[PDB]
Design a protein around this ligand. Structure first.
Ligand code: COZ
Ligand code: 5UG
Ligand code: 5UG
Lengths: 392, 394, 371, 391
C-alpha cells in the first residue's frame, strides 16, 4: 500500500498549573479527559470515529491501570475505543503524537486523539519493595515519585539539573547568559498572556473543591534581572542553574486530533496542519539536554528541509543552560523560537509538555501566518524528539 | 513511500518466576536487559544497527526514568539508540511488538527490539498525595502498586478476578469447566517443560545473592501433581460465592521477553534468517466489567486485516489470565482447543503482566517452528476492557 | 511520711501547630523541671527522681522523662521514668511522687507531665516490618491511635462525650463561661505566677478564643465546646515535709489524698466520679469541704455530667477557666490543672482543693491538697 | 509502712524476632500473664486494686497498653491501670511501684510486670508527614531502634555503649564469647531438665495452630568456633556480636503482689517478701553499668552485703556489660543466672525486668535459697535492682 498523510484537525491544552496551585486537586487523568473531549469537540469529528487514544504520562505511580484508557473513558468515548499510555519522560506527549501519525501513515487507523497529561502536584511518595518483603530491622526511605521517576537520572543518580550544569560547562553557558534567557522567556510569556495569544489554544478547567482556571499561572510577572541574579544555585552550591532559569514542576494536559488527510476532507473537516516528519535522537544521559540536536537533524532530513526553512520553533526550556546550548549548536534564529515564551515561564508538566509545545506551536503559526514549524524537547535519559509540521 | 514487510528475526524470554521466587531479586529492567541482549545475539544482527527499543512495563512505580531506555542501556546498546516504555496493561508486551512492526512498515526504522518486562515481586507500596500536601490530622492508606496499577479495575474498583466472575456468569463457564481447563494447562506445561520444548526460547538468568548464587532457567510456577480433586477443593479467591480460584487463575509473576523485528529486505540483505512475517495486529475494546472478552474484537479485526478466517490459523496462544475468561473467549470465537496453548498457558506458567504479551508470542513462534505450522495467532485480554491480537506467518 | 508541694509551674499552653509546635515535649518538660527546681529553691543535687507523664511517646526516643531530666541540667545520677495513664498521666506522676515520699523511698521528686501533640508522628503497622506481601495497609495518626481514640471501641473520645451527653444538651453555655473566665484571668495577670516563659518568649496561653459567642457543626459536641489538641508541660517539686523544712524551703500545700477510679470505656468522661469519691473518702472529707475545684474540661458534655453527678458548686470550679479555653496537652494536663489549682487557692486564700480529670479507656484520677 | 509479698509469678516463654509470638500483640501477651498470675495466686479477681505494666515500644499500641491488657485479661472495668516506661527497667519498675503502693497502704493487691512485642513494633513517618513532605525524600524510622535500642543522648546503639564498657573495663571478644557460651549451656541444661516448666504459662498461637511453651531464642548447638566466627554487629572494629549480645524478642511476665496480712487473711500463700528496691543513674555512654549503683543502694536499703545474696539474676543485655558489672561488684559467678540469661533466653525490653524476677523466684524455690537479687541495666544510663526473700 501507499503511505498516507496525517493532518492535525484540532489542538488544545489546559492552562498550566503551578506546583500545589490551581490544578493540584484535578487528577492527570481528569486533565487528560478534559483535553481529549475538547480536542474532539474543536475538531468537529464524529466521536464514534475515533480509532485510538494515545497519551503520554510519566508519573504513572498509583494512577491505576493504563492512565490513557482511563482518560479516554472519562472523556465520554465509547468502551470500544482503545488506548495506551506512553512514557518517553519529557518526550512522552510528543511521542504520542508521533505514534498517532505513524499509525495513520501506515493505514492502521484514520482518527486518533493524542497528547499527554501530568499532575506533578498529586504525585505520590513511595516505599520500596522492602515494604512488601518486610523492612525487618533498620530505617528505610520514603521516595518522592517526582524525583525517582521524573526528575532524577536513572543512570547517574543525580538531578536533571546536574545534567544542565554538565551542558553549561561543556558549552560555556554562563549564569548571566542563563538568567538573560530566563528573563526573555518571562517577558514573552507575559506579553502573550496580556495580548490573549493563548486564548484560542486553552480549554478552561472548572475546579470544584469553585472556579474556572484558564490562565497559565507559573509565569513570574514581576520578574527582574536583579531578582534572578540574587537566586542561589538549586542543584550544586557552585553551580549556575537556579529555580529562576529552570522550568518548574507543573500540572497540565494537551491533546490533538490527528486524521488521515483524505478521511478528514471527506468528513467535511478542516485540516489545520500536515505532520511532515518526526524523529527521536539519543545522546549521553549526562548531556540529556542536548537531545534535541540529533532529533531535530533527523526530522529535518526526513522532511527534506534545512533548519533555515523553519518559520517557527518551539524548543522546550527544561533549563536555560540546555536551551541555549541546543540553540548555539544548531544555530537557531532566536527570533523564531518560543515566540510566546517557553517553559521557564510557562512550566513543564513533564508527560504533557511535548504535546503542549506542539499545540502552542501550531496556534502561534496560525496567529502569525507561518508555514513551517519545528517542535523539539530534551528527554531525561539522554534522548530528544522532534516534529515538523506544515500549516494548513 | 510504499509500506514495507516486517519479519521476526529472533525471539527469546526468561523463564517465569513465581511471586517472591527465583527472580524476586532481579529488577524488571535487568530482566529486560537480559532479553534485549539475548534477542540481539540470537538474531546475529550487528548491534550498531538497532534503531529503537520498545518495552512493555505496567508497574513503572519507582523504577526510574523510562524503564525501556534503562534496559536498553543496561543491555550494552549505544546511547544513540532510542527507546520508550509502553503501558497497555497485560497487552503491553505485545503492543510493543505491534508498534515495532508498524514503525518498520511505515519506513521509520529498519531494526527494533521489542517486548516487555515485569517484576511484580519488587513492586512498591505508595502513600497517596496527602503525604505530600500533609496528612494534617487523621489516618491515611498505604497502597499496593500491584493492585492499584496492575490488577484492580479503575472503572469499577474491583479485581480483575471479579471481571472473570462476571464473564463466567455471562457465558455459563462453571467451576468444573474452569478447573478442567486448569488441569489441562498444568498437564501440557509439565509435558513441555520436562521434554525440553522451552529450551530453545529461554535465556538463563544468573541470580547472585548474599545467601546464594544460581542459574534460573526453568519456569517455576507450574504445580506438578495438580489433581482434579485438589483443584475442586480450593476456595474462591475473589468472591466467597465465586468460581475463580488460585488454581484456575494465573499468578503474579516475574519475567521478560524480547524479539528482534526487521524490515524484510534489510534482514535478507544482511544474510539473516527471517523466522516469521508479522501479517497483522489489532486492538479491541470491550466493557471494563467484561475485560476478559477483549480478545474477541481484537482477534476478529486482526484476522480481517490479514484476510484470514480463524480456521486458517494453525496454532493459537490465547493467554490464560483466568480459566473463566479463556473459556468464554474460546466459546465465543470457536477455537479448536487442540490448536491452543499447546505447551500450556499462564495458569501453569505465570503472568508477568507487562511481559506476557511478548512472552506468548515467543512461545507461539517456537511452537510453530517445532511443529512446522504456517499461521499463528497471539491474543490477550487487557484490564480496562481491551484486547490485543497478532497474526504471524512462517 | 507527709508530702508537700514546694513549687508548681507550667508552660503557657500552645495551640495545635501554634507557638510551641517546634519545641519538643522533652524540651518543654526540661523547661518546667528546671523552673520547678529554681522556684522551689532546692539544692538541685538533692533531687531523688523525676517522674513525667507523656502519652504520645512514639518516636520520642528512650524514656522521655529521663531525656527531659538530663536536658534540664540534673546530674546523670538522677533517675527518672515516664508514665502513661492517658489524660491522667501528669496527675498520676504527682501521685506517684507523693507515694514514694510517703513510703520513705525518696525525699525530693520532680513530677508532672509534658506533651507535644503538634509534633506527634504517623505510623505504618507492623505489617511493614514483616512485609505487606499483597494488599493495602494503613498509615496511622499517632494523636488518634495512641491518644484520642478508644482502644476498646475504636471511636473518638468525642463519641464517649456524646455517650455521656445522651446518658445525662448542645454544652455551649459552659464553653462560653470557660472562655470568659480564661480571658478575665489572663488579662488580669492571674496566670503570671504559675507560668514559666518558653523561648521558642511564649508566655501567654494562646488557645483561648476571645470574643466567643458557638451555636458550629458537630464527629452535640463541637470544636467550640470541646478542648483542643495542644502542646505544653507542667511540673512540681514534691518533698517530704520535715526535709523541706529542715532545708529552709517553704511548703506550699500538703498532698492529703489521691486515687484513681475505673468506669466503662464508653463512658470514660465519668471517670472523675469514682476517683473523686475515693480521694475524698481517703482524705476523710465530704465534697462540700472542698473550697476550690479543678475538674478538667475535656468536653463540656463530660464536665457537666460529672458536675451534675457529684453536685459541684459551679462557683468553685475552674475559677480561672478550663481546658475548653486553655487547651488539653494530654500527658501534661493532669499536672497543669494541679498547678492552676494551687495558685488559685493561694490567690483566694482557700484551704482545700480537688483536682480531677477523666481518662481515655474508662478511668479517672483525683487529688486533694491542703494549703 | 506495710510489708509486701509476691503471691504468684509467671511468664510466657520468650519468642524470637519474627518467631512464634510474632503474631501475638504485647497487650495480648500481657493479658495472658495477668490472667495466669491471678489464677496461680488463687486471689479473688474482684480484689485486684491495680495493674501496672512495663512496655517500652508503645507506638501505635493504643491508649494506655496496661489498661488494655487488664481489660483483655477479664478484670472489671473498675480496676485501674497504667503503663510504665523505664526502658529495659520497665518490668521491674512496675513491680517496685506495686510494692511501694502496698507499703504506703494505698492498695492491697496489684498485678505488676511487663510486656513487649518487638516483632510487631511499627515504623514511623515523622511529623513532616503531617505538614507535608512537599518535595524531596523522607525517612521511615524503625521504632525498635528509635524508642528502644538507640541512645537518645548520643544517637548510637545500645551495642555501642557495650563497646564503650568493654574498652573501659578490658572485656575482650574472647571473654565475651566465653560468657555467651556459658549462658547458652546453662539455658540448654535448664530447658532439658524442665526447670522453666513451673514459671511458664503456655500461649495458644492461632494463625497453623500451636502451643508455645518453650523459650525459642536459645541456640542449642552453640559452639565456641561458631561464636568466634561472627562479625561485630555495631562497629566493624568492635567486639560485640549477635552471639554475645541478647536478642530482639517478644514476651510478657507478671506477678501478684499483696500486703502481707491481707494475703494471709485471704488464706493465700506468700512466696517471698520484697525486701528492698532501688534505681541508679550512670552516664548514658556507660548505661551497661547501671546495675552497680542500683544494686549497692538496694543492698544498703535491705541492710545486706552482696555476699548475703544466695542467687542473682543480672540481665545479660550484652556479655560486655554483664562481665564489667560482675567484675565491678564482685559477683560469685556460680550464683548468677543459674538457668541462663538473656544472651540465650532473649530480651523483650519492657518485660525483661519482670521476667528475670519470675525466673529468680522459681530458681530460689527449686534450690531452696533464701535471698535473691534481680538487676538490669537501662538505656539512658540507669539501673534498677530488687532484693527478695523466700518465702
Ligand atoms: C546484635 C543484633 C543487631 C543482631 O540481630 P540481627 O541483625 O537480626 O542478627 P541475627 O540475624 O540475629 O544474627 C546475625 C547472624 O549471627 C548468627 N548467630 C547469632 N548467635 C549465634 C550463635 N549462638 N551460634 C551461631 N550463630 C549465631 C545468626 O545465625 C545470624 O546469621 P545468619 O545471617 O546466617 O542467620 C541484636 O539482635 C541486637 O540488637 N541485640 C541487642 C538488643 C538490645 O540492644 N537490647 C537492649 C539491651 S540494653
Ligand atoms: C527545584 C527547582 C529548580 C525549583 O523548585 P523549588 O520548589 O525548590 O523552588 P521555588 O519554586 O519554591 O522557588 C525546580 O522546580 C525544578 O525542579 N526544576 C527542574 C524541573 C524540570 O524542569 N524538569 C525537567 C527535566 S528535563
Ligand atoms: C490472588 C491469586 C489468585 C493467588 O495469589 P495468593 O498469593 O493469594 O495465593 P497462594 O499462593 O496463597 O495460593 C493470584 O496470585 C492472582 O491475583 N491471580 C490473578 C493475577 C491477575 O489478575 N493477572 C491479571 C489478569 S487480567
Amino acid at each position: 500500500a501507499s503511505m498516507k498523510n496525517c493532518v492535525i484537525v484540532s489542538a488544545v491544552r489546559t492552562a498550566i498549573g503551578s506546583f500545589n496551585g490551581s490544578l493540584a486537586s484535578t487528577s492527570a487523568i481528569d486533565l487528560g479527559a478534559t483535553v481529549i473531549k475538547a480536542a474532539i469537540e474543536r475538531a468537529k469529528i464524529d466521536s464514534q470515529h475515533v480509532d485510538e487514544v494515545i497519551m503520554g504520562n510519566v508519573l504513572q505511580a498509583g494512577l491505576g491501570q493504563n492512565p490513557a484508557r482511563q482518560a479516554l473513558l472519562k472523556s465520554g468515548l465509547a468502551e470500544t475505543v482503545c488506548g495506551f499510555t506512553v512514557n518517553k519522560v519529557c518526550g512522552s506527549g510528543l511521542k504520542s503524537v508521533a505514534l498517532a501519525a505513524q499509525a495513520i501513515q501506515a493505514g492502521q487507523a484514520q482518527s486518533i486523539v493524542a497528547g499527554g497529561m501530568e499532575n506533578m502536584s498529586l504525585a505520590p511518595y513511595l516505599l520500596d519493595a522492602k515494604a512488601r518483603s518486610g523492612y525487618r530491622l533498620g530505617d528505610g526511605q520514603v521516595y518522592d515519585v517526582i524525583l525517582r521517576d521524573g526528575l532524577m537520572c536513572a543512570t547517574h543518580g543525580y538531578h536533571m539539573g546536574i545534567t544542565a550544569e554538565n551542558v553549561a560547562k561543556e558549552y560555556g553557558i554562563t549564569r548571566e547568559m542563563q538568567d538573560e534567557l530566563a528573563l526573555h522567556s518571562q517577558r514573552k510569556a507575559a506579553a502573550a498572556i496580556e495580548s490573549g495569544a493563548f486564548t484560542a489554544e486553552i480549554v478552561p478547567v472548572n475546579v470544584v473543591t469553585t472556579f474556572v482556571f484558564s490562565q497559565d499561572e507559573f509565569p513570574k510577572a514581576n520578574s527582574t534581572a536583579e531578582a534572578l541574579g540574587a537566586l542561589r544555585p538549586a542543584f550544586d552550591k557552585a553551580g549556575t542553574v537556579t529555580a529562576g532559569n529552570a522550568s518548574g514542576i507543573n500540572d497540565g494536559a494537551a491533546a490533538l486530533v490527528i486524521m488521515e488527510e483524505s478521511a478528514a476532507l471527506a468528513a467535511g473537516l478542516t485540516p489545520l496542519a500536515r505532520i511532515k516528519s518526526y524523529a527521536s535522537g539519543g545522546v549521553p544521559p549526562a548531556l540529556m539536554g542536548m537531545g534535541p540536536v540529533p532529533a531535530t537533524q533527523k526530522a529535518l532530513q526526513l522532511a527534506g528541509l534545512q533548519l533555515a526553512d523553519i518559520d517557527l520553533i518551539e524548543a522546550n526550556e527544561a533549563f536555560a543552560a540546555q536551551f541555549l546550548a541546543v540553540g548555539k549548536n544548531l544555530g537557531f534564529d532566536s527570533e523564531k523560537v518560543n515566540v510566546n515564551g517557553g517553559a521557564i515561564a510557562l512550566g513543564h508538566p513533564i508527560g504533557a509538555s511535548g504535546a503542549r509545545i506542539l499545540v502552542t506551536l501550531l496556534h502561534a503559526m496560525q496567529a502569525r501566518d507561518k508555514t513551517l514549524g519545528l517542535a523539539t524537547l530534551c528527554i531525561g535519559g539522554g534522548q530528544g524528539i522532534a516534529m515538523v509540521i506544515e500549516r494548513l
